[PDB]
């Protein structure tokens, strides 16, 4: 049951080891995974904020 | 028969099959920082190798 009803889903604060101030913090934007298997160089980034 | 860090590290009968088996060496570690996360060390993906 894959949905597109994004109105009832929520962005979250992620915890990541590198920040603006070069120390781990809780950022609204947090890279969970990065996928790089396209043949042109495009990468897919999963971020903790809804875009 | 599933060696870690080499070919056949994760296996299944089909791509969409829910019977997925693997023996990649995942080791979960005690968190050394006063936050929440799951620190883990894993063997390199044997498909990539």
UniProtKB/TrEMBL annotation, chain A:
Protein location: Host cell membrane; Host cytoplasm; Host nucleus; Virion membrane
Disulfide bonds: 19-25
Source organism superkingdom: Viruses
Record's subunit section: The precursor of protein E3/E2 and E1 form a heterodimer shortly after synthesis.
Protein's UniProt name: Structural polyprotein
Organism of this sequence: Western equine encephalitis virus
Lineage, uppermost ranks: Viruses, Riboviria, Orthornavirae, Kitrinoviricota, Alsuviricetes
Residues represented out of the complete protein: 320 to 370 of 1236
From TrEMBL, chain B:
Subcellular location: Host cell membrane; Host cytoplasm; Host nucleus; Virion membrane
Domain of life, source organism: Viruses
Quaternary state and interactors: The precursor of protein E3/E2 and E1 form a heterodimer shortly after synthesis.
Name of the molecule in the record: Structural polyprotein
Organism encoding this protein: Western equine encephalitis virus
């Amino acid at each position: 049951s894959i949905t597109d009803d994004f109105t009832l889903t929520s962005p979250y604060l992620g915890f990541c080891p590198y920040c603006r101030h070069s120390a781990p913090c809780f950022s609204p934007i947090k890279i969970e995974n990065v996928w790089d298997e396209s043949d042109d160089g495009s990468i897919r980034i999963q971020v903790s904020a809804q875009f | 028969a599933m060696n870690p860090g080499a070919f056949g590290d994760i296996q299944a009968s089909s791509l969409d099959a829910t019977d997925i088996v693997a023996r990649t060496d995942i080791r979960l570690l005690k968190p050394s920082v006063k936050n929440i996360h799951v620190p883990y060390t894993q063997a390199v993906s044997g498909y990539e190798m």
